[PDB]
Amino acid sequence: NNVTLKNLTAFQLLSQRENICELLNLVESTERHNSIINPERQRMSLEEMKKMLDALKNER
Amino acid sequence: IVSFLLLECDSELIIASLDFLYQYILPGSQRITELFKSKECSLILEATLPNLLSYNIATPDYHLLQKHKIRLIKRITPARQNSIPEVKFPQELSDVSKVACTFLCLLSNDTDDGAGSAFCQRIRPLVLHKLADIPPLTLALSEYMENT
Amino acid sequence: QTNPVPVTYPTDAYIPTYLPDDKVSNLADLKKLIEMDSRLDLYLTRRRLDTSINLPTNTKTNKEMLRIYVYNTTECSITIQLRGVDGGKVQYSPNLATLIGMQTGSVNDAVYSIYKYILINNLFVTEQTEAQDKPELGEVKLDSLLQKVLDTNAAHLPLMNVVQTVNKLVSPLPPIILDYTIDLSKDTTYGATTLDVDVSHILHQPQPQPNLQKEEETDAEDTAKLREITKLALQLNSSAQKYQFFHELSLHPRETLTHYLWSSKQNELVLQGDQYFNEDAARTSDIYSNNNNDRSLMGNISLLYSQGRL
Amino acid sequence: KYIEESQAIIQELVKLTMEKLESKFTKLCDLETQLEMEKLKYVKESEKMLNDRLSLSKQILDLNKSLEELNVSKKLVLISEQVDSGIQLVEKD
Amino acid sequence: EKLKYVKESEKMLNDRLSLSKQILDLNKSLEELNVSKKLVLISEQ
């Protein structure tokens, strides 16, 4: 919750190193990439959108 | 900018918006017309200015009275009920209220039969309530009460 | 409140505007939704302000009565209250009841009527009134009636004094009082002794609704929803920044790679600037030894001695 | 495909929601105009009643004084707790 | 709020008319016995 010079430099360096290691394909981030996408959450949100759209369609 | 006026928890932002609007409508009357041409700005000003008059000055509270119940004092003296609690009145305004008073005074000095003068007449009764609750407001809104 | 209460969690976040409009096709809808949310907020916050006009009246918008019997039976004051009496309706003094046209009302109604009377008859000392005809400005010139009401033989009381006298001129509704002293000769009386008193204001019982149980819940729910939305917006920003980095790399590889190398070297140099400050390097004679190739520690001694601090 | 269907659905949903909210806003604006009209009429009538009440109370005071001047045992009394509720000439001791 | 305003306006109008009738009758009675002035509603000029 506190930000010092050490924390800032470490954060920036970590981001840079992660990006570069991803360029060389030296990292497997399936867990993060599927917790952010979360296809289950995608299906849930899609069904919620469909239900809301049907509700708006039938009120007329 | 008038939406900025609509806030409540930031005195400095309100004072900045009021200063900008003052400097805006200051030179003449065509700018008053351009300001009140918009329906949203008109509505927000009409709903905001009288409430900005009584901004953070601790008006007399008539709710302690409604909550105060009247009984007989338990206890050879005759039976009194109880004394109605006192009601205090404010003795000075806040900066936001002073700036709003100056803005209303400036806005009232426009030519009749044109916008800005009809605004004061649409706003008058709420200002009368405010004046009844705050005497320094009656002293400070002299130019507004003259041109109305 | 007069200040926005600085908090510890992020309260908002920008939406990135450097994404390609062709690939991302739902930014326009999100911005439309944000605008509509702002409009709804404006409308609610505006219409939740008090702008209702209430002029002083009474008899605001039955057969229900009550009879009280008193009788001495054989073989002294009496006071009665009704507990439906609050400060919301009081008894105006008989003098004030001639200034205003009513006898019973609220306190704010009395104050408003006093101010309206001072307005109708021109009694405020103004610039024009002084120029036409010493009293100060914004003072009230008293008439015979105002003097009979305030009980002052002065002429130029200010306004605070007038409204404080108004506070003086108010008393609660008087209770029921009977004077049935005694009766000892007759067997029983059951005389008239009847009082017809309204109890309508007590059997109707207009009560308010329960509060402070959903306000806190609503506040907490809205805060949680706003924080979730802000977290999602920050995640979007992170993804967009990674995309922008890789796009820039695809455009100019050499410059971005040189920048990466230089920045990594510099950040690694920075992160190694406090390693010999841990009470282990401090308590042992290693970092003070001259055999260190880098002598950035002992070399200061001379200067530190000349400054006297040491 | 997945995201494409979601995009079409989102377009339609946003369109319908915007239309619904704009209709609600129009209704609210009309109702607000009506409220302002009624408030203006009420303000006019209430100011008239208040001025009449104050003037009538002062006149009642003067007339009771005059009745006491000419030796008349009558008084002018409010029928109820106001002036608007009615006044009448009654007799006392 | 709108309903409140409408109701109060109508009540005020009715009370005004009733008060005018009462004032007319009281002025007639005062003229009957003796008087120097008459009750006057400001609204009627």
The DSSP-derived string for C73-106 is: B---EEEE--S--BTTSEEEPTTHHHHSS-SEE-
Interface present between E and C (3 or more CB pairs within 8 Å): yes
CA-CA distance, B5 to B46, in Å (whole number)? 11
Q: What is the DSSP letter of C3?
A: S
As a whole number of angstroms, the distance between CA A34 and CA C229 comes to 19
DSSP line for B38-53: SHHHHHHHHHHHHHHH
Instruction: Please give, rounded to a whole number of angstroms, the shortest distance from the CA of A46 to a CA of chain D.
Output: 7
The number of angstroms, rounded, from the C-alpha of C211 to the middle of its chain's C-alpha atoms is 16
Which amino acid would we find at residue D37? M
Rounded alpha-carbon distances, angstroms, from residue B13 to B93, C13, C43, C211, C267: 18, 21, 19, 31, 41
How far is B23 from chain C, CA to nearest CA, in Å? 24
Cα distance between residue B47 and residue B35, in whole Å: 15
Chain A contacts of C260, Cβ < 8 Å?
16, 20
CB-CB under 8 Å, E1 with C61: no
Handedness of CA C198, C203, C206, C207 (dihedral sign): positive
Residue range(s) defining the domain that contains residue A20: 1-60
Where b means 16+ CB within 10 Å and e means fewer, D15-44 reads ebbeeeeeeeeeeeeeeeeeebebbeebbe
Q: Experimental method used, please?
A: cryo-EM
Phi–psi pair at C179, nearest 5 degrees: -120, 85
* CB D56 within 8 Å of CB D83: yes
Is D81 in CB contact (< 8 Å) with chain C? yes
Question: Does D88 map to a domain?
Answer: no
For residue D68, the enclosing domain spans: 1-82
Cβ–Cβ below 8 Å for B9 and C1:
yes
Outline where DSSP puts E strands in chain B. Answer: none
Q: Do E13 and D45 touch (CB under 8 A)?
A: yes
**Subunit contact B81:C51, Cβ cutoff 8 A:** no
The residue of chain C nearest to residue A18, with distances taken between CA atoms, is C242
| Range 13-42 of E in CB contact (< 8 A) with C | none
What residues have CB less than 8 Å from C96, skipping those under 6 apart?
Answer: C110, C149, C166, C169
Query: Does the residue D89 lie in any domain?
Result: no
Q: Phi first, then psi: give them for residue C80, nearest 5 degrees.
A: -140, 130
Instruction: Name the one residue in this structure whose structure tokens are 């949203």.
Output: B40
Q: How many CA atoms lie within 13 A of C234 on its CB side?
A: 10
Does the distance separating the beta carbons of C61 and E7 come in below 8 Å?
Answer: yes
CB contact under 8 A, C4 and B11: no
Q: Which of C139, C105, B135, B127 is nearest to D53 (CA)?
A: C105
This structure's resolution (Å) is: 20.0
Residue C10 contacts B where some CB pair is shorter than 8 Å: no
Sequence-separated contacts (24+) of C177-186 with Cβ below 8 Å: C177/C77, C177/C78, C177/C79, C177/C80, C178/C70, C178/C77, C178/C78, C178/C79, C178/C80, C179/C76, C179/C77, C179/C78, C180/C70, C180/C72, C180/C76, C180/C78, C181/C76, C182/C72, C182/C76, C183/C72, C184/C72, C184/C74, C186/C72, C186/C74
- B-C interface: how many C-beta pairs under 8 angstroms? 115
Interface membership of C268 toward A (CB under 8 Å): yes
Cβ proximity of C208 and B63 under 8 Å: no
| Residue of chain D nearest A44, judged by CA positions | D6
Chain A residues in contact with D1 by the CB 8 A cut-off are none
Please give the sequence-ordered ranges of beta strands (E in DSSP) within chain C, or none if there are none.
67-68, 77-80, 90-92, 104-105, 170-171, 176-179, 195-196
Answer yes or no: is D67 within a domain: yes
Listed by number, the residues of chain B in 36-75 with a beta carbon closer than 8 Å to a beta carbon of chain C are 43-44, 46-48, 50-51, 56, 60, 62, 64-72
Determine contact: D87 vs chain C, CB below 8 A. no
Structure tokens at C156: 């130029």
Residue D87 within a domain: no
Place of tokens 């029928």: D79
C residues 190..209 contacting A (CB < 8 A)? none
State residue D89 phi and psi, 5-degree precision: -95, 115
SS3 C263: helix
Contact C169, C93 (CB under 8 A): yes
Residue D1 and residue A46: Cα distance in Å, rounded? 13
Contact residues, chain D, for C99 at CB < 8 Å:
54, 57
If you ran DSSP here, which 8-state letter would residue C299 be given? G
> Residue C247: which region, alpha, beta or left (left: phi > 0; alpha: psi -120 to 50)?
alpha
Residue C253 backbone class (left: φ over 0; alpha: ψ -120 to 50; beta: rest): alpha
Length of chain A: 60
Number of folded domains in chain D? 1
The verdict on a CB contact (< 8 Å) between D63 and E37 is: yes
Contact of B146 with chain C, judged by CB distance below 8 Å, is answered with yes
> What CA–CA distance (Å, rounded) separates C200 from D30?
38
> In this structure, are residues C1 and B8 in contact, taking their beta carbons and an 8 Å threshold?
yes
The total of structural domains in chain A comes to: 1
Give the single-character DSSP code of B111: P
Q: How far apart are CA D82 and CA A45, in angstroms?
A: 64
To the nearest whole Å, the CA of B75 is away from the closest chain C CA by 14
Q: Using alpha carbons, list the distances in angstroms from residue A26 to A12, A20, A29, B36, B76.
A: 19, 9, 10, 64, 98
Q: Which of B9, B84, B125 sits opposite C170 (nearest CB)?
A: B84
Residue type, B77: T
CA angle C140, D47, C115 (to 5 degrees): 20
